[PDB]
Amino acid sequence: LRSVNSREPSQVIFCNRSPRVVLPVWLNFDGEPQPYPTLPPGTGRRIHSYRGHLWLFRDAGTHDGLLVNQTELFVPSLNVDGQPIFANITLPVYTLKERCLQVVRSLVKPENYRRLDIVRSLYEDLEDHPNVQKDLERLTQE
Amino acid sequence: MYVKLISSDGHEFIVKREHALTSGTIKAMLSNEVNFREIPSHVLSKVCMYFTYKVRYTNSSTEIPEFPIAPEIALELLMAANFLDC
Amino acid sequence: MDVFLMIRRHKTTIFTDAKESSTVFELKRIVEGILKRPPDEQRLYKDDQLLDDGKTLGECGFTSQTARPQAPATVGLAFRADDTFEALCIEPFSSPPEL
Numbered sequence A: 001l002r003s004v005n006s007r008e009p010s011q012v013i014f015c016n017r018s019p020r021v022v023l024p025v026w027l028n029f030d031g032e033p034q035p036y037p038t039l040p041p042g043t044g045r046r047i048h049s050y051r052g053h054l055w056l057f058r059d060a061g062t063h064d065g066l067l068v069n070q071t072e073l074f075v076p077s078l079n080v081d082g083q084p085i086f087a088n089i090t091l092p093v094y095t096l097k098e099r100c101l102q103v104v105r106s107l108v109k110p111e112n113y114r115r116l117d118i119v120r121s122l123y124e125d126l127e128d129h130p131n132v133q134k135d136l137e138r139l140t141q142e
Numbered sequence B: 001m002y003v004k005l006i007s008s009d010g011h012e013f014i015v016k017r018e019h020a021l022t023s024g025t026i027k028a029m030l031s032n033e034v035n036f037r038e039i040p041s042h043v044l045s046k047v048c049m050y051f052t053y054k055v056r057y058t059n060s061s062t063e064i065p066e067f068p069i070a071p072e073i074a075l076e077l078l079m080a081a082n083f084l085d086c
Numbered sequence C: 001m002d003v004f005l006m007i008r009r010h011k012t013t014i015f016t017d018a019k020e021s022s023t024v025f026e027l028k029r030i031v032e033g034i035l036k037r038p039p040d041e042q043r044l045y046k047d048d049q050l051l052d053d054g055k056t057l058g059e060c061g062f063t064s065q066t067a068r069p070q071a072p073a074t075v076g077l078a079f080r081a082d083d084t085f086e087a088l089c090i091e092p093f094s095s096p097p098e099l
């Protein structure tokens, strides 16, 4: 799951249509996620990248998954035929459960999450942070 | 068209089947009414809200906004969430 | 615009959406289908103020920023026909614990 090493510069632009600080993530020629500087919500930026490179977006504070042009993964396309390629970054409809872990994650130090009377099985779901390395291992199947 | 979902504190929530069948749990208790012995109303209202906020916004450009969860309600919501599978 | 309401009365809450342009009275019909009571037997309120069947939701102050699917506005509902209307009454919601 790598970017193809073209050297065909492609001008993209990351519009952040989300309440969250988004962290753009370029996935390397080898596979490893590299992170760029983040985007305050609303906020756009012009970006130089390359055809067939791969990106993905998430909360810079709680690695949650956002979408880019409605899919999971961004590949910059034909840099011209008009010029910049448009990268719109969105909340999905999180499920109510994941959302519910979010607020709780954001409300309690995960040291002190064992004193929160709910089924053990929900303690495990909650200590289970979203991870890019995970999600990659996830996405990598389809 | 519509289905009722009965809180454990009496309260009744008429919602559309289409919005309802979002809970894989509820898809099966229907198939009409559903009592919930252990979900108070202050929860079932947010749930119903989620079904409308889910049914509205999925499959769409129109910048999806944040579903807001009030702290007081988080745990109890979390537990209905998991039970209702959604 | 679609507007998203929570039509409340006693221990009863209907969640429905409706156009902004549509009318108090059209909403009154939608109630007919559900609780089977004809528009004559029902009055409809927002926040005490008593609503008029000929006025648009938009104009009663229901907008796409008043009533967001995620936080839908409430509409009071009260019954019994010309033969004396019951007062406006809505049991509040179960209270949240600790923190």
Ligand SMILES: Cc1cc(CC(=O)N2C[C@H](O)C[C@H]2C(=O)NCc2ccc(-c3cnco3)cc2)on1
Pocket: A006, A007, A024, A026, A036, A037, A038, A045, A047, A048, A049, A050, A053
């Ligand atoms: C050949 C070649 C070289 C490279 C490494 C590289 O220059 N990259 C990798 C990704 O395409 C990003 C691109 C890059 O470094 N672009 C410059 C850049 C700097 C800052 C940002 C930036 C700022 N805020 C968010 O992103 C975006 C692009 O990729 N192919």
